[PDB]
Write a protein that binds this ligand. Sequence first.
Ligand SMILES: CC(=O)N[C@@H]1[C@@H](O)[C@H](O[C@@H]2O[C@H](CO)[C@@H](O)[C@H](O)[C@H]2NC(C)=O)[C@@H](CO)O[C@H]1O
Length: 176
Amino acid sequence: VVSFIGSTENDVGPSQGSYSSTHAMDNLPFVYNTGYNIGYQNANVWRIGGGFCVGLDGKVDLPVVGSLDGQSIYGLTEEVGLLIWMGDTNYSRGTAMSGNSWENVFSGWSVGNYLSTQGLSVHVRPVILKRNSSAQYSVQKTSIGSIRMRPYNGSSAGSVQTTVNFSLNPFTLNDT
Ligand SMILES: CC(=O)N[C@@H]1[C@@H](O)[C@H](O[C@@H]2O[C@H](CO)[C@@H](O)[C@H](O)[C@H]2NC(C)=O)[C@@H](CO)O[C@H]1O
């Protein structure tokens, strides 16, 4: 059994976050290592129980403008892009996203003869694609994509909500 207990619209990263780096940035694309700072995490989005089996699919809607180490660089503006990870609750379990199709981002688990929950997480890292004289780049709130629970091994969502969405909070990049 399962029920939706989270939120449909979720903001990624703190509003007006400030991200800076002391790294030179001589060769692009340059990735800001913001760790999991620009992210959203919730260990409790659906409640499940009684042998329910569920995993997660993820989908990014931003245009793909290239890749880095087998993971797509999604474009936000001509100068800024993102690397994106979606997956189970723990940020560490994030699956590097590529493409714009629904992708398996959490292989899943089966809750035993008890009650528990299924959560999720998303984090992104900003990428400098093109130079700028101002050195500073501000990004506006922007839709990223979505995550959907994937019941398996017989389990079924029924009419319980399966998808939640994500928006990137605005932020600024400050190249020291
Ligand atoms: C080994 C272990 O702790 N197993 C169960 C946990 O998986 C379970 O936690 C839930 O795991 C899901 C899949 O990893 C997460 O999506 C979900 O957010 C997480 N929920 C919480 C509250 O941490 C816990 C809790 O029911 O029980 C264990 O038996």
